[PDB]
Structure formats: structure tokens, C-alpha cells
Amino acid sequence: SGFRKMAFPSGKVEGCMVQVTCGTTTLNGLWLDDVVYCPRHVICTSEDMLNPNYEDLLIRKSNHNFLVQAGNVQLRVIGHSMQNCVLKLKVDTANPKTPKYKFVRIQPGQTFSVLACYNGSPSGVYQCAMRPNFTIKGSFLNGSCGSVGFNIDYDCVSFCYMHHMELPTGVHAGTDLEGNFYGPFVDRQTAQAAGTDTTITVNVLAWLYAAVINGDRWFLNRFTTTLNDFNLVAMKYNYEPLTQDHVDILGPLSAQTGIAVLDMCASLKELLQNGMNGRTILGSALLEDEFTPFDVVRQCSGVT
Amino acid sequence: SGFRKMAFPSGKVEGCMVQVTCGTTTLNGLWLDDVVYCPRHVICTSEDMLNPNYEDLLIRKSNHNFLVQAGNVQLRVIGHSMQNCVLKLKVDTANPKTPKYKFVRIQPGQTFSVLACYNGSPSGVYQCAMRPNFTIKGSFLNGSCGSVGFNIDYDCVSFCYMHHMELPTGVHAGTDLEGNFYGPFVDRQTAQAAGTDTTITVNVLAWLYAAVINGDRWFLNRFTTTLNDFNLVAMKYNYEPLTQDHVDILGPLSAQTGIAVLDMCASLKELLQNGMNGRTILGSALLEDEFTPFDVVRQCSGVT
Ligand SMILES: *CC(=O)N1CCCN(Cc2ccccc2C)CC1
Numbered sequence: 074s075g076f077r078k079m080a081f082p083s084g085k086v087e088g089c090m091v092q093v094t095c096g097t098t099t100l101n102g103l104w105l106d107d108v109v110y111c112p113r114h115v116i117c118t119s120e121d122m123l124n125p126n127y128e129d130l131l132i133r134k135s136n137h138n139f140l141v142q143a144g145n146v147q148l149r150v151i152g153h154s155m156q157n158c159v160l161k162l163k164v165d166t167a168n169p170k171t172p173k174y175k176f177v178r179i180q181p182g183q184t185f186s187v188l189a190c191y192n193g194s195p196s197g198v199y200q201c202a203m204r205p206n207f208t209i210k211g212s213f214l215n216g217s218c219g220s221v222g223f224n225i226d227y228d229c230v231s232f233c234y235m236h237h238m239e240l241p242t243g244v245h246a247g248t249d250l251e252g253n254f255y256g257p258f259v260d261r262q263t264a265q266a267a268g269t270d271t272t273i274t275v276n277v278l279a280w281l282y283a284a285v286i287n288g289d290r291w292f293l294n295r296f297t298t299t300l301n302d303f304n305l306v307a308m309k310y311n312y313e314p315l316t317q318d319h320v321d322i323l324g325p326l327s328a329q330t331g332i333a334v335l336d337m338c339a340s341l342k343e344l345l346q347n348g349m350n351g352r353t354i355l356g357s358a359l360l361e362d363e364f365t366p367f368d369v370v371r372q373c374s375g376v377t
Numbered sequence: 378s379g380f381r382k383m384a385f386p387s388g389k390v391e392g393c394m395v396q397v398t399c400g401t402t403t404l405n406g407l408w409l410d411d412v413v414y415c416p417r418h419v420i421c422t423s424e425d426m427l428n429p430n431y432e433d434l435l436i437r438k439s440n441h442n443f444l445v446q447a448g449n450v451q452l453r454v455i456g457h458s459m460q461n462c463v464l465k466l467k468v469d470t471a472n473p474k475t476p477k478y479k480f481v482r483i484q485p486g487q488t489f490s491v492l493a494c495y496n497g498s499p500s501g502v503y504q505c506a507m508r509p510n511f512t513i514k515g516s517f518l519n520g521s522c523g524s525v526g527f528n529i530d531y532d533c534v535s536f537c538y539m540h541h542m543e544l545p546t547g548v549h550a551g552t553d554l555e556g557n558f559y560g561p562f563v564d565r566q567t568a569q570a571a572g573t574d575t576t577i578t579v580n581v582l583a584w585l586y587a588a589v590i591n592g593d594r595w596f597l598n599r600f601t602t603t604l605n606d607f608n609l610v611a612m613k614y615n616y617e618p619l620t621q622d623h624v625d626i627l628g629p630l631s632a633q634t635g636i637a638v639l640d641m642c643a644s645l646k647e648l649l650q651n652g653m654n655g656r657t658i659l660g661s662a663l664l665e666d667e668f669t670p671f672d673v674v675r676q677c678s679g680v681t
């Protein structure tokens with residue numbers, strides 16, 4: 074019992090983190106097989122970051138200009154290419170600690186663990202969600218670029234995020250491992266405002282399911298609603314609209330708790346319309362939206 | 378920028394987790410050098426848990442009754458002893474993945490990372506505090522006993538917690554690695570009510586410092602207070618009393634932000650007396666007390 078913002082064990086990803094230095098710029102790389110993946114702005118000085126031409130900048134660089142350190146041992150770079158906003162460095166050694174892995178591009182609403190890194194050294198691990206505006210609310214200091222977000226299924230690491238950018242508003246933008254940015258963000262020091270940070274409605278409902286399962290039930294009410302009625306309330310409160318797909322995904326939690334999805338929606342509706350009245354749910358004074366139904370099932374079943 | 382509930386990278390502790398089976402009971406062990414540490418109630422059935430005599434129960438057990446599995450390879454048990462509420466199993470192999478480590482007994486207010494485990498397999502990692510009533514607010518399902526709490530300094534793991542017990546109220550009790558319970562808890566299925574869960578005042582002030590450093594400053598006011606005046610307010614709201622030691626510890630955060638500790642105390646006072654007025658601080662609608670001044674300095678400096 075008890076419910077916690079829970080990250081994947083970070084071990085398998087700790088074994089992949091390296092330091093990448095190009096001239097004076099240092100950030101983190103990800104060493105999988107005989108390839109090190111890092112943000113392409115490794116080749117920039119802050120003098121370049123206002124209007125960088127990455128193709129032109131990279132012409133000036135050679136395999137020996139990319140200093141890759143794995144602990145206190147240097148990797149020999151035998152090749153380099155630009156894929157979208159990442160560099161792939163070919164090294165002459167496969168990472169012996171390469172886990173089973175995939176690169177997956179996640180959807181907004183989906184959660185993942187970040188291993189925050191500085192000079193290829195892991196510092197901490199936390200749980201994130203891809204916000205509906207394709208930002209993540211991270212904790213990232215200078216030198217954290219190249220840190221990766223990941224999910225783990227038994228033995229298999231799915232890398233979904235590389236950290237690249239902090240918006241003036243202190244939220245975070247980055248790429249999948251093919252170097253494609255989530256949202257409209259570009260690796261350039263320019264005016265880039267985030268869209269509306271809407272609340273991930275299906276994740277709030279999953280979290281209300283988690284609450285019921287762990288004893289917090291004061292918010293359960295006598296009411297129900299319809300998808301259309303609920304969504305009128307959702308819109309007013311900048312909640313993502315709830316679909317029949319979302320309802321289907323909440324099915325197993327529905328089944329476990331014996332509370333119909335649309336009844337729980339009615340509970341959420343009254344919570345939006347009335348607030349918490351100074352009360353708390355799983356030790357939170359607001360509605361948590363960074364637990365997926367899958368996350369709730371996991372932490373309330375005990376998958377390893 | 379951004380502030381997250383952040384755990385230590387769990388890798389070094391993942392390499393130490395094993396499965397311990399005694400007859401039909403299975404839980405987690407910690408393999409350091411040629412010793413596996415697990416909760417002593419591994420020797421119990423739920424039939425024993427009402428009034429277990431551990432000395433008498435252990436007489437009936439032998440080295441070969443303690444089945445220790447590390448992945449899919451079995452460790453040979455060449456010895457066993459009871460230390461307080463832990464068993465130490467001597468194995469014929471030193472854990473090749475033993476990190477540098479210490480056993481440290483933490484004080485209430487101090488934070489640590491938990492690696493939640495089931496059948497010696499890590500499932501997730503989160504950040505905890507030893508509550509002033511010597512409970513922790515964990516997330517622990519059946520089979521999670523033996524999971525450990527830890528801190529990491531560069532290369533050195535300080536193990537402070539082994540999970541043993543869930544109180545009827547769904548909070549968690551456990552031992553240090555010498556098998557001594559935090560608080561008055563005993564590994565027995567008996568009436569055990571937790572004391573007052575007071576708020577860790579120095580950790581709230583550290584968190585307010587973190588907020589200021591990350592841009593959230595609406596709660597800064599024109600007032601100051603005294604240690605004695607503040608503590609009258611602390612008592613009323615079941616906040617731990619603030620000492621000159623707490624003020625000394627907040628010194629570096631004070632220095633960085635240019636806000637005097639007693640001014641910030643006055644900010645906290647008005648927050649207690651007036652609440653948040655439906656506002657938030659670092660994305661929280663209540664006062665977070667599970668970040669130590671040391672945690673704030675770390676996440677706002679970037680230690681690895
Ligand atoms: C993430 C990190 O290590 N750094 C801090 C922020 C990114 N920065 C480069 C930069 C600056 C402005 C706009 C875009 C980018 C990519 C330096 C490294």
C-alpha cells in the first residue's frame with residue numbers, strides 16, 4: 074500500500090552514459106553497441122546558438138574532435154553522422170553494458186523515467202510525462218543535455234527522450250533517439266513559447282483509481298455523467314478531452330475497483346467544480362496527471 | 378531549472394538485490410561481500426506473525442533451508458546468525474557487484490531513496506524521508522520486505538533502511554542494516570499505532586529556498602519573525618520546532634538567495650496562517666517537507 078511517484082531502476086541506463094566533449098562544449102552521450110548518441114549542439118559555442126547552421130559547423134569537425142569518455146577510459150571515434158538533431162558517434166568498442174533496448178517515440182500523456190547526468194555521471198532519477206504541449210517538466214541544470222528518458226519492460230529499455238533545451242519559462246524540450254524534437258521546438262536560442270499545458274485527464278482518472286485502491290475515497294460521490302457532459306467540464310478546466318479509447322484503457326482499473334469509468338468521471342467533475350476543500354488525495358492537494366493507467370496497474374500489482 | 382522529487386541512481390543497489398526463500402516465505406535480501414541481509418520474519422509463516430519467538434523458530438532452521446538466488450544462479454549458504462531483526466546469511470561467494478558502502482542509522486527528517494523489490498527483482502525507485510514518528514510513507518506491496526533505503530556519496534552507498542512492516546494505516550516501518558527498528562515498532566502482527574506525523578520544518582524552508590531559486594516567489598513577504606515567535610506558529614500547525622542548528626544548516630541557501638532564514642520563516646508563517654489561496658509552489662498545492670537542505674543544494678548545484 075501507499076502510492077509514490079516511482080521511476081524505473083536506472084542501473085541499465087547508468088551503464089550507457091558517457092561524456093562527450095567537442096572543443097570546449099561538454100554534455101552527456103548514450104553508448105549503445107558501437108554508437109554514442111548525443112545532442113548535435115555539442116559542436117556549438119553559445120556564440121553559435123543564436124542561428125547555428127549545423128551542417129556547416131559539422132564540416133569543420135573530425136572523428137578525433139569528438140572526445141568520448143566512459144568512466145576514466147577514452148573511446149576511439151571511427152565515424153560520425155548527423156541524424157536530425159542528434160550526432161551518432163561510431164566507436165571501435167561495443168558497450169559491454171548495452172542492455173536490450175529500442176528507440177520509441179512516445180505520445181503526449183505517456184510517462185517515462187529521466188536519469189539526470191553531468192559529465193556522463195548519473196546524479197538522480199525521477200518520473201516525467203510528455204506534456205500535451207510536447208514539453209516535459211524536468212529538473213535539468215547546465216551540462217544535463219544528453220540525459221535520456223526511458224521505460225523498462227522486464228529486460229528491455231525503450232529510450233524515448235534525449236534532453237536538449239530549457240525554455241525561458243523553465244520547462245524542457247528534447248528529441249526522441251532519432252533526434253526528432255517532440256513539439257515544434259528547434260535546437261536554437263530563439264523565441265519559443267510553449268502552448269497550453271492541458272491536464273492529462275485519463276492519467277488523473279487512473280490516479281483517482283490508485284487513490285480508491287489505497288483507501289483515499291472521500292471524493293467518491295453518488296453521481297454519474299456522460300463522455301459529452303464530462304468533456305464540457307474538461308474543456309472549461311483545460312483538461313484533455315476524454316475518448317472511448319481512454320475509457321477502454323481504464324477498463325482493468327474499473328474492473329478491479331468496481332467503480333464505472335463514467336462514475337469516476339463524475340467524481341473528477343465535482344473535484345474540478347468544487348476543488349479539494351483543503352483536503353488531500355494520496356498526499357497531494359491537487360490532481361496528479363503523470364501516472365498512466367499502466368503505471369497505476371504496475372505500482373498496484375508489483376511488476377519487476 | 379525545474380525541481381523534481383529525485384532519487385539516487387539505483388544501479389549500485391540493483392547489483393546487491395537477491396531473493397531469499399525459507400520454506401514457503403520469499404522476500405528480498407541485500408548481498409554485500411559474502412553476507413546476505415534479509416528481514417528475520419523470512420523464517421515465519423503468517424501463523425507465526427501473531428507472537429513469533431524468533432530465537433526458537435531459528436533453532437529449527439539450517440544453512441540449507443535458506444535458499445538465496447542472485448538472478449538465476451543459487452548462492453551456497455555456509456552460515457547464518459540473527460542480529461536484532463535481520464538475518465545475516467554467510468555465502469561462499471563475495472558479490473562481485475558490491476559497491477563501496479556503509480550502514481548508517483539516519484535521524485528523522487533525513488531523506489533517502491528506496492529501491493522497491495519483489496523476488497530480488499527491482500521494480501521502481503522513489504525518494505523517502507524518515508518521518509518524525511519513525512515511519513516512512515513508502516509504496517510497498519506484499520513481497521517488498523527486504524527492499525532497502527540508501528544514500529549515495531560519489532561512489533559510496535550508505536544503507537539506512539530495510540523494509541519490514543506495513544502499519545494498518547498503510548504507512549511503513551523498518552530497520553537500519555543492524556536490524557534495529559526506527560521508532561517503537563516490533564516485527565509482530567499486533568496493535569501498533571503511529572505517533573503524530575509532524576511536518577519537517579527545516580525541509581519545508583529548504584524547499585521554499587528551492588522555489589525562490591527556480592522563480593516561484595509569490596509567497597515572499599515584507600515580514601520577519603524570531604525563532605521563539607515562529608515556533609509558537611510551528612506548534613499550532615504540528616510543525617517540528619526550528620532550532621539554531623536548523624538555521625545554521627539553511628545558511629548556504631540563505632547566502633545563495635540573499636533571503637535571511639528568519640525572513641523565510643516569516644514567509645512560512647504567513648503560508649501556514651493563510652494557506653496557498655489556491656496557488657502552487659514548484660507544482661505543489663501543499664508544503665513539501667521531504668527535501669533536506671542538502672537535497673536542495675544538490676539538485677540546485679548538480680552533484681554526481
Ligand atoms: C542542457 C545543457 O547541457 N545545456 C544547457 C542548455 C542548452 N545549451 C545549448 C542551447 C542554448 C540555448 C538554446 C538551445 C540550446 C541547445 C547549453 C548546454
Ligand SMILES: *CC(=O)N1CCCN(Cc2ccccc2C)CC1
Nearest residue numbers: 418426519520521522541564565566
Ligand atoms: C513486506 C513483505 O514482503 N511482506 C508483507 C508485510 C510483512 N509480512 C510479515 C508481517 C506481517 C504482519 C506483521 C509483521 C510482519 C513482519 C509478510 C511479508
